Amino acid sequence: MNPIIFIIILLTIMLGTIIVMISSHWLLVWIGFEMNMLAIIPIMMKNHNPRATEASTKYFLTQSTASMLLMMAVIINLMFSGQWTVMKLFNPMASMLMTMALAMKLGMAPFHFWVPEVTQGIPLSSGLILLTWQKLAPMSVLYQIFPSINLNLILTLSVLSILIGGWGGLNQTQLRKIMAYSSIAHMGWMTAVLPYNPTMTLLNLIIYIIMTSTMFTMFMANSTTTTLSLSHTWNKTPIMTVLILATLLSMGGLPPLSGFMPKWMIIQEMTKNNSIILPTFMAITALLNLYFYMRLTYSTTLTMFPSTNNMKMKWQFPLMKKMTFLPTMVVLSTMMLPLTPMLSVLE
Amino acid sequence: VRWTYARSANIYPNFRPNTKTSLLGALFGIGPLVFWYYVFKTDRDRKEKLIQEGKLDRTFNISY
Amino acid sequence: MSMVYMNIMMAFTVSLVGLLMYRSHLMSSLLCLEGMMLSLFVMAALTILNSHFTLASMMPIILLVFAACEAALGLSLLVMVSNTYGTDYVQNLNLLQC
Amino acid sequence: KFYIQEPPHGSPNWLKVGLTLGTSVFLWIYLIKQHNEDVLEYKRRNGLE
Amino acid sequence: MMLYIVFILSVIFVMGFVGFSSKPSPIYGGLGLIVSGGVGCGIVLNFGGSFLGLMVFLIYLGGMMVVFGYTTAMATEQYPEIWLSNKAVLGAFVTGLLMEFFMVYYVLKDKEVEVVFEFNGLGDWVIYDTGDSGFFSEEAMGIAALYSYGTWLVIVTGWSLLIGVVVIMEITRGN
Amino acid sequence: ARQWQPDVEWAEQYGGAVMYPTKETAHWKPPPWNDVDPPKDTLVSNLTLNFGPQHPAAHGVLRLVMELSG
Amino acid sequence: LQYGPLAYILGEKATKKMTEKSKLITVDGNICSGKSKLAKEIAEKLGLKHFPEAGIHYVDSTTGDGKPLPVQFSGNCSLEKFYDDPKSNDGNSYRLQAWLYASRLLQYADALEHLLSTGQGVVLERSIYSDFVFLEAMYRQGFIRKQCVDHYNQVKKVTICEYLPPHVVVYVDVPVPEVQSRIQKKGNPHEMKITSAYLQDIENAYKGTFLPEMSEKCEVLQYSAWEAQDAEKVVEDIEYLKYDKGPWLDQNDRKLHKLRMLVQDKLEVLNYTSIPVFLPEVTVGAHQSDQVFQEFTELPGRKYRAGYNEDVGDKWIWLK
Amino acid sequence: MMTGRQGRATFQFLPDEARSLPPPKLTDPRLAFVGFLGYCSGLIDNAIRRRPVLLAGLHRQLLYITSFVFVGYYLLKRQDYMYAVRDHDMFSYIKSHPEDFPEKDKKTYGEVFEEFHPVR
Amino acid sequence: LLDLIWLEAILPKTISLAQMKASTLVTNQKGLIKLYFLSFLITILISMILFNFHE
Ligand SMILES: CCCCCCCCCCCCCCCCCC(=O)OC[C@H](COP(=O)(O)OCCN)OC(=O)CCCCCCCCCCCCCCCCC
Ligand SMILES: Nc1nc2c(ncn2[C@@H]2O[C@H](COP(=O)(O)OP(=O)(O)OP(=O)(O)O)[C@@H](O)[C@H]2O)c(=O)[nH]1
Ligand SMILES: [Mg+2]
């Protein structure tokens, strides 16, 4: 792509999301999703290969179906309330349709199948946009309609997402597929707490984005997309293996790292509402994710896998990728737990 | 090396749950626990019953 | 509700089932997607016109414009798929299985 | 001269160095100024001496 | 029977949908959608949406569907399988018309049916407005207001269409 | 002795398509190193046209075997 | 300004720098074919930059102080040991070929970066495009296993697809008996052990595979040993080529910006030369590679990024 | 829960009523920790780019510390404002609904009966 | 009998074995658009008929 056109397309992806986030009108929310989908397809197609074309097609079909269901919910809401204001919906059928539409857009289980495939089929930079920025608009909508959401439906989607994400990631060797299932699992935490305290949905979203952004950036720095290609990092950039280790432990939710904070604060809110079984089940099931994060740390940082002779040639050249914000992101991904009370700025 | 390996690491791979292993494990594993539970639970219930009725001698029993 | 809504809502349901139950041609599924938009356009227009919601009269046009633009994007992807494989069959789009 | 090819970071980028140090000074001066006025306004509103 | 023109049209509307939703060869799928679109415009006209109805013909049928048929010819179909000559296509078509027939049967007989929502079968005319004597078309006034009230809508809609041109050129270049 | 570190046999456990092979994933293979699959399906874009004159009133006896590209 | 998208937007576009003289020329031929002598002659007459053939230590010559590094930092690849013992069970034969392919791949990216950044043409002696003739010759003599050939083809497949071929391929044709005579004259004890079977397989690969393939996309010029002596005629022929085939005609500023972004980043160039395919010839255990890597960083000017090494006289490090 | 506060000046980082609160002290231990995180980010930046970790680019390290401390100061001001608002809302509600928060008539342990469970 | 066998079988070994089996069920998919969207239809139908999420 012409670099100027690439900038305009990224700004349009952001504009679509911003429109969703500032709109008080359901039509403008729908337009924001349409604009966002239109602008993201080129960045998925940009490397021109059959896998990128398949991923773009699978993504287009999923998102277009979701957006039609969203519009159906809006129109039903208009028929039963005569207004367009972005707020609680006034019909239970409209609520179910919009909740399902947003679950499809988020890739929540059982609407999840596209996330692993689409992420695998596109470049790492595109996957970073797909798994971080693309969650902002659907979450911002769920944040505003949650009082009218069916409690059983949203909690069912959350439980399934945590289960499927945890189990799906166990069988993966591709880094992009691991991040896709990790995203699905982390999605379930955000929606599980939404009925009780939407502020903790925002907290988990922000910290998830920071950690996911850190992981993709480090994968991009060495152009690694598989477990075995990442296992060579120790013999090229040792510092990167330590940073990868810290972030993976943080994503695993281990104290005293930053990733424990969202799990800690969500458990607190659910227990205040006499929800004991569900947070206990969620916390235990999250051990699945810790397992396949720990497997990566074993092959990357805590042991030394075999290298190749041609790796010696790489020693003579410096890293020249930008790695934008990486030093800041990795610190925020790991060392923020002592500042947990700062979550009140999200209130 | 073969001897120490056979006495540890090689055991579980060659284990099969069947009638012999299941029964012995239940008999040696759970058996003693159930037995000792009923010995102490019985003894303590009897002793507790006597203390509530003042029928157990604890005249100089002040260390516990 | 009035009787007409029953049929418009059936049409959306029918085209949604048609969208979710693929055969082979990717083109046949895109038509079901456009069918969904047509039924939304009609139901929106009927609700807005009957209620005399004057400023909402422009909403069906915006719906049609944005949905046609999204249909152009869908057709472009179909052409790129047909270039890769020579057909628009969805069973050739299974590389990402692994 | 040791390097066969001149490194991109052979010598300081004196423009960046100047803009880096100036930015730090600006933020520090601005932060101190902000803090002093917040303390003054906090005292005025609470009628404190 | 002319007093149920809207309902009769909506029955044809559903039948056309069952047409292309059973997904025969794309060539005939486009035909079902074209007929449904034309019937759809007819329903909108009978509610006082003359401009909206004609937009369907001009933009949906004369624009979008022409391009679909154009693309189908080049990239998809050149000759079709006979309509309803396939087991699944015919079974889906029969199933749809049976469901439509029964919905129509009960709504007309009991004057009311109930599936997700409650529907009344008195006739769509009963809900119409009984006061009309302005010297203009309310629909046209609302659409004309796009340029006065809807500045923000024009900007984002205009931006999306421009980005559509850019994006589609990117997608189809192939390198 | 020296600390054990993974050998090729250990490392190859993580190089398959999946972590836990099954009968239903036996045919699965790792994707291309650079994500590019070879274009082997259909690429036949050159028309061959036996060309004559629109009206045979003047030429009549011209046969032109042309190969076109768009 | 370091080249990048912003420099491109500010007018740094390859079509400005390049002219009809901005050509990439490779000279090929068998061992002792005189290709090197001609290549220097072509480069001088046409005013092109000459690149001596990439050997084992080509990468050393572009980094650090430019001097060759000890052999253990090339994996102990030895051309001499390939001639003394081509079937050694230590894997030297394929380990050498894999290292040389990466060296040529690096040199080719260096040639493109020079051509695209400055607009001046370049002359290479062999390239990544003809490197495979040596692989076929090794394989047919039984010096390497068929698994080694598969590894080479896997690496070549995902690396060569990213580059443009040369504008001109100059082949110097010398029969094997004459090549064998010329090797004896040159008086290299290890090179004298080359067999005619090995030299013949190189020739067969050049003529059966290389030249037919490059003819479809490059301007191929062939010369006998005697004709190649007249560089004036060779240069004359190059100047009157039409240049009407090949992917270079389908290039614009946008596509050359993407190419330049690649060839400038040498780690992105070499990314796939170290794919995790565990072939014994090229696989190094962690203990060895850990040991050698630590010794590499202990070399002068190697501990830190270039320009941050006090031990070689870098200054102002606290402000860089 | 506090999204629709009656006195919520919407989409304002620090509404004007926040100016009645004492500012965070520049010696606040949380602000010192934020500065430390900035210093760690500076060291990591050197490490990933293979510069001498402690000495390289002291100007860059200083801007890491300043920017973290600068942003940290305002985030703490908002943090303290949001907890002040929470307490203000809580106490106002308790006053407005005395029937829901009655002062208990609370007895001494001499009067309240607690069962004894012997440990024997 | 106890330490190396049954105390492994009743907890870590069996729990680990079940997760592995569940993982292969989740990830043994054919990558077919047709089947994935067919499962969406089942999800929507179940959500209404069985769980009445639309109410
Ligand atoms: C004026 C120029 C413009 C730039 C000015 C900016 C300066 C501030 C930026 C931060 C830099 C701090 C100073 C760093 C000094 C590093 C000097 C150095 O690298 O020399 C190494 C020195 C001695 O080591 P040596 O004996 O030579 O060799 C030992 C072999 N193992 O080893 C040392 O003694 C180094 C000691 C460690 C460095 C100090 C650690 C500072 C910690 C900061 C905590 C941040 C807290 C922020 C809180 C703020 C809240 C308001
Ligand atoms: N195994 C192997 N040896 C190579 C390769 N490239 C060069 N060599 C060896 O490097 C030595 C010198 O290469 P040549 O250029 O062909 O020999 P030369 O004497 O310089 O011949 P001219 O330059 O044409 O005059 C020869 O002994 C080659 O066998 C290679 O890709 N693989
Ligand atoms: Mg030579």
PDB file of N, CA and C in Angstrom, chain F residues 14-64:
ATOM      1  N   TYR F  14       6.959 -29.925  19.332  1.00  0.00           N
ATOM      2  CA  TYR F  14       6.255 -28.661  19.192  1.00  0.00           C
ATOM      3  C   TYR F  14       6.214 -28.164  17.756  1.00  0.00           C
ATOM      4  N   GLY F  15       6.669 -28.966  16.801  1.00  0.00           N
ATOM      5  CA  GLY F  15       6.709 -28.575  15.413  1.00  0.00           C
ATOM      6  C   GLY F  15       5.606 -29.125  14.542  1.00  0.00           C
ATOM      7  N   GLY F  16       4.681 -29.900  15.096  1.00  0.00           N
ATOM      8  CA  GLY F  16       3.585 -30.437  14.321  1.00  0.00           C
ATOM      9  C   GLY F  16       2.484 -29.421  14.094  1.00  0.00           C
ATOM     10  N   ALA F  17       1.475 -29.849  13.334  1.00  0.00           N
ATOM     11  CA  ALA F  17       0.299 -29.013  13.133  1.00  0.00           C
ATOM     12  C   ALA F  17      -0.437 -28.778  14.444  1.00  0.00           C
ATOM     13  N   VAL F  18      -0.569 -29.819  15.264  1.00  0.00           N
ATOM     14  CA  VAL F  18      -1.268 -29.747  16.538  1.00  0.00           C
ATOM     15  C   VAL F  18      -0.366 -30.318  17.622  1.00  0.00           C
ATOM     16  N   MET F  19      -0.720 -30.022  18.872  1.00  0.00           N
ATOM     17  CA  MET F  19       0.019 -30.573  20.001  1.00  0.00           C
ATOM     18  C   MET F  19      -0.342 -32.032  20.258  1.00  0.00           C
ATOM     19  N   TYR F  20      -1.605 -32.407  20.058  1.00  0.00           N
ATOM     20  CA  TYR F  20      -2.118 -33.725  20.432  1.00  0.00           C
ATOM     21  C   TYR F  20      -2.653 -34.416  19.184  1.00  0.00           C
ATOM     22  N   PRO F  21      -1.808 -35.123  18.437  1.00  0.00           N
ATOM     23  CA  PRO F  21      -2.269 -35.727  17.180  1.00  0.00           C
ATOM     24  C   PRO F  21      -3.415 -36.704  17.401  1.00  0.00           C
ATOM     25  N   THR F  22      -4.366 -36.685  16.473  1.00  0.00           N
ATOM     26  CA  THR F  22      -5.493 -37.603  16.462  1.00  0.00           C
ATOM     27  C   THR F  22      -5.662 -38.151  15.053  1.00  0.00           C
ATOM     28  N   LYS F  23      -6.582 -39.107  14.912  1.00  0.00           N
ATOM     29  CA  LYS F  23      -6.842 -39.678  13.595  1.00  0.00           C
ATOM     30  C   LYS F  23      -7.505 -38.669  12.669  1.00  0.00           C
ATOM     31  N   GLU F  24      -8.234 -37.704  13.227  1.00  0.00           N
ATOM     32  CA  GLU F  24      -8.945 -36.727  12.416  1.00  0.00           C
ATOM     33  C   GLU F  24      -8.065 -35.563  11.990  1.00  0.00           C
ATOM     34  N   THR F  25      -6.871 -35.429  12.562  1.00  0.00           N
ATOM     35  CA  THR F  25      -5.934 -34.377  12.189  1.00  0.00           C
ATOM     36  C   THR F  25      -4.650 -34.941  11.599  1.00  0.00           C
ATOM     37  N   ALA F  26      -4.631 -36.226  11.247  1.00  0.00           N
ATOM     38  CA  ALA F  26      -3.416 -36.829  10.713  1.00  0.00           C
ATOM     39  C   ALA F  26      -2.976 -36.144   9.427  1.00  0.00           C
ATOM     40  N   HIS F  27      -3.927 -35.817   8.552  1.00  0.00           N
ATOM     41  CA  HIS F  27      -3.597 -35.179   7.284  1.00  0.00           C
ATOM     42  C   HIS F  27      -3.165 -33.728   7.437  1.00  0.00           C
ATOM     43  N   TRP F  28      -3.394 -33.109   8.592  1.00  0.00           N
ATOM     44  CA  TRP F  28      -2.990 -31.725   8.786  1.00  0.00           C
ATOM     45  C   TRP F  28      -1.476 -31.591   8.704  1.00  0.00           C
ATOM     46  N   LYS F  29      -1.022 -30.527   8.054  1.00  0.00           N
ATOM     47  CA  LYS F  29       0.392 -30.214   7.947  1.00  0.00           C
ATOM     48  C   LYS F  29       0.629 -28.768   8.353  1.00  0.00           C
ATOM     49  N   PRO F  30       1.824 -28.445   8.842  1.00  0.00           N
ATOM     50  CA  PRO F  30       2.104 -27.062   9.209  1.00  0.00           C
ATOM     51  C   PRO F  30       1.930 -26.149   8.013  1.00  0.00           C
ATOM     52  N   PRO F  31       1.486 -24.916   8.232  1.00  0.00           N
ATOM     53  CA  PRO F  31       1.282 -23.996   7.117  1.00  0.00           C
ATOM     54  C   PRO F  31       2.608 -23.543   6.537  1.00  0.00           C
ATOM     55  N   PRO F  32       2.590 -22.832   5.412  1.00  0.00           N
ATOM     56  CA  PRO F  32       3.846 -22.368   4.817  1.00  0.00           C
ATOM     57  C   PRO F  32       4.588 -21.422   5.747  1.00  0.00           C
ATOM     58  N   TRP F  33       5.915 -21.425   5.625  1.00  0.00           N
ATOM     59  CA  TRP F  33       6.745 -20.593   6.489  1.00  0.00           C
ATOM     60  C   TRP F  33       6.420 -19.115   6.333  1.00  0.00           C
ATOM     61  N   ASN F  34       6.055 -18.685   5.129  1.00  0.00           N
ATOM     62  CA  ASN F  34       5.757 -17.289   4.848  1.00  0.00           C
ATOM     63  C   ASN F  34       4.283 -17.046   4.547  1.00  0.00           C
ATOM     64  N   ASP F  35       3.408 -18.000   4.864  1.00  0.00           N
ATOM     65  CA  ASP F  35       1.957 -17.882   4.734  1.00  0.00           C
ATOM     66  C   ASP F  35       1.468 -17.934   3.294  1.00  0.00           C
ATOM     67  N   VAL F  36       2.338 -18.196   2.327  1.00  0.00           N
ATOM     68  CA  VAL F  36       1.974 -18.144   0.917  1.00  0.00           C
ATOM     69  C   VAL F  36       1.750 -19.562   0.414  1.00  0.00           C
ATOM     70  N   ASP F  37       0.554 -19.823  -0.106  1.00  0.00           N
ATOM     71  CA  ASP F  37       0.280 -21.083  -0.778  1.00  0.00           C
ATOM     72  C   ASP F  37       0.461 -20.931  -2.283  1.00  0.00           C
ATOM     73  N   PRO F  38       1.041 -21.922  -2.957  1.00  0.00           N
ATOM     74  CA  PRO F  38       1.326 -21.781  -4.387  1.00  0.00           C
ATOM     75  C   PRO F  38       0.054 -21.580  -5.188  1.00  0.00           C
ATOM     76  N   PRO F  39       0.092 -20.746  -6.229  1.00  0.00           N
ATOM     77  CA  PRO F  39      -1.096 -20.560  -7.067  1.00  0.00           C
ATOM     78  C   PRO F  39      -1.173 -21.599  -8.170  1.00  0.00           C
ATOM     79  N   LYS F  40      -1.835 -22.721  -7.898  1.00  0.00           N
ATOM     80  CA  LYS F  40      -1.865 -23.844  -8.821  1.00  0.00           C
ATOM     81  C   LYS F  40      -3.261 -24.163  -9.335  1.00  0.00           C
ATOM     82  N   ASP F  41      -4.286 -23.442  -8.889  1.00  0.00           N
ATOM     83  CA  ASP F  41      -5.659 -23.830  -9.175  1.00  0.00           C
ATOM     84  C   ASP F  41      -6.054 -23.509 -10.613  1.00  0.00           C
ATOM     85  N   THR F  42      -6.447 -22.265 -10.892  1.00  0.00           N
ATOM     86  CA  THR F  42      -6.899 -21.887 -12.229  1.00  0.00           C
ATOM     87  C   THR F  42      -6.305 -20.541 -12.612  1.00  0.00           C
ATOM     88  N   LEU F  43      -5.475 -20.532 -13.660  1.00  0.00           N
ATOM     89  CA  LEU F  43      -4.970 -19.293 -14.260  1.00  0.00           C
ATOM     90  C   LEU F  43      -4.879 -19.533 -15.767  1.00  0.00           C
ATOM     91  N   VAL F  44      -5.953 -19.193 -16.475  1.00  0.00           N
ATOM     92  CA  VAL F  44      -6.049 -19.397 -17.917  1.00  0.00           C
ATOM     93  C   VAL F  44      -6.834 -18.231 -18.501  1.00  0.00           C
ATOM     94  N   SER F  45      -6.161 -17.104 -18.733  1.00  0.00           N
ATOM     95  CA  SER F  45      -6.847 -15.856 -19.041  1.00  0.00           C
ATOM     96  C   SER F  45      -6.725 -15.424 -20.497  1.00  0.00           C
ATOM     97  N   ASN F  46      -6.023 -16.180 -21.339  1.00  0.00           N
ATOM     98  CA  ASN F  46      -5.815 -15.794 -22.732  1.00  0.00           C
ATOM     99  C   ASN F  46      -6.883 -16.435 -23.608  1.00  0.00           C
ATOM    100  N   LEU F  47      -7.807 -15.615 -24.101  1.00  0.00           N
ATOM    101  CA  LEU F  47      -8.773 -16.068 -25.090  1.00  0.00           C
ATOM    102  C   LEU F  47      -8.090 -16.341 -26.424  1.00  0.00           C
ATOM    103  N   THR F  48      -8.602 -17.338 -27.140  1.00  0.00           N
ATOM    104  CA  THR F  48      -8.247 -17.566 -28.534  1.00  0.00           C
ATOM    105  C   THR F  48      -9.505 -17.378 -29.366  1.00  0.00           C
ATOM    106  N   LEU F  49      -9.445 -16.468 -30.333  1.00  0.00           N
ATOM    107  CA  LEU F  49     -10.609 -16.083 -31.117  1.00  0.00           C
ATOM    108  C   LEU F  49     -10.323 -16.320 -32.591  1.00  0.00           C
ATOM    109  N   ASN F  50     -11.108 -17.194 -33.211  1.00  0.00           N
ATOM    110  CA  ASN F  50     -11.131 -17.308 -34.663  1.00  0.00           C
ATOM    111  C   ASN F  50     -11.921 -16.136 -35.228  1.00  0.00           C
ATOM    112  N   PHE F  51     -11.220 -15.174 -35.812  1.00  0.00           N
ATOM    113  CA  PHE F  51     -11.792 -13.878 -36.144  1.00  0.00           C
ATOM    114  C   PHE F  51     -12.066 -13.805 -37.639  1.00  0.00           C
ATOM    115  N   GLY F  52     -13.302 -13.466 -37.990  1.00  0.00           N
ATOM    116  CA  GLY F  52     -13.660 -13.149 -39.349  1.00  0.00           C
ATOM    117  C   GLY F  52     -14.194 -11.734 -39.429  1.00  0.00           C
ATOM    118  N   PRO F  53     -14.614 -11.309 -40.615  1.00  0.00           N
ATOM    119  CA  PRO F  53     -15.174  -9.964 -40.756  1.00  0.00           C
ATOM    120  C   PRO F  53     -16.647  -9.923 -40.388  1.00  0.00           C
ATOM    121  N   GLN F  54     -17.060  -8.792 -39.815  1.00  0.00           N
ATOM    122  CA  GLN F  54     -18.455  -8.647 -39.412  1.00  0.00           C
ATOM    123  C   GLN F  54     -19.383  -8.912 -40.588  1.00  0.00           C
ATOM    124  N   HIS F  55     -19.108  -8.282 -41.725  1.00  0.00           N
ATOM    125  CA  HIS F  55     -19.870  -8.480 -42.935  1.00  0.00           C
ATOM    126  C   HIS F  55     -18.961  -9.069 -44.004  1.00  0.00           C
ATOM    127  N   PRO F  56     -19.354 -10.154 -44.671  1.00  0.00           N
ATOM    128  CA  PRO F  56     -18.482 -10.769 -45.675  1.00  0.00           C
ATOM    129  C   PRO F  56     -18.557 -10.130 -47.051  1.00  0.00           C
ATOM    130  N   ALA F  57     -19.160  -8.946 -47.166  1.00  0.00           N
ATOM    131  CA  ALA F  57     -19.349  -8.328 -48.473  1.00  0.00           C
ATOM    132  C   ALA F  57     -18.023  -8.003 -49.153  1.00  0.00           C
ATOM    133  N   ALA F  58     -16.999  -7.627 -48.387  1.00  0.00           N
ATOM    134  CA  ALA F  58     -15.734  -7.179 -48.957  1.00  0.00           C
ATOM    135  C   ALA F  58     -14.605  -8.179 -48.733  1.00  0.00           C
ATOM    136  N   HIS F  59     -14.303  -8.526 -47.479  1.00  0.00           N
ATOM    137  CA  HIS F  59     -13.185  -9.433 -47.214  1.00  0.00           C
ATOM    138  C   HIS F  59     -13.586 -10.882 -47.469  1.00  0.00           C
ATOM    139  N   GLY F  60     -14.465 -11.423 -46.629  1.00  0.00           N
ATOM    140  CA  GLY F  60     -15.032 -12.736 -46.863  1.00  0.00           C
ATOM    141  C   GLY F  60     -14.097 -13.899 -46.600  1.00  0.00           C
ATOM    142  N   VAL F  61     -12.873 -13.820 -47.116  1.00  0.00           N
ATOM    143  CA  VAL F  61     -11.942 -14.940 -47.065  1.00  0.00           C
ATOM    144  C   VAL F  61     -10.754 -14.604 -46.177  1.00  0.00           C
ATOM    145  N   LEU F  62     -11.006 -13.983 -45.033  1.00  0.00           N
ATOM    146  CA  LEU F  62      -9.967 -13.745 -44.041  1.00  0.00           C
ATOM    147  C   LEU F  62     -10.306 -14.525 -42.783  1.00  0.00           C
ATOM    148  N   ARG F  63      -9.386 -15.384 -42.364  1.00  0.00           N
ATOM    149  CA  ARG F  63      -9.471 -16.094 -41.099  1.00  0.00           C
ATOM    150  C   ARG F  63      -8.298 -15.646 -40.245  1.00  0.00           C
ATOM    151  N   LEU F  64      -8.590 -15.119 -39.064  1.00  0.00           N
ATOM    152  CA  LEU F  64      -7.578 -14.578 -38.167  1.00  0.00           C
ATOM    153  C   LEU F  64      -7.671 -15.322 -36.846  1.00  0.00           C
TER     154      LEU F  64
END
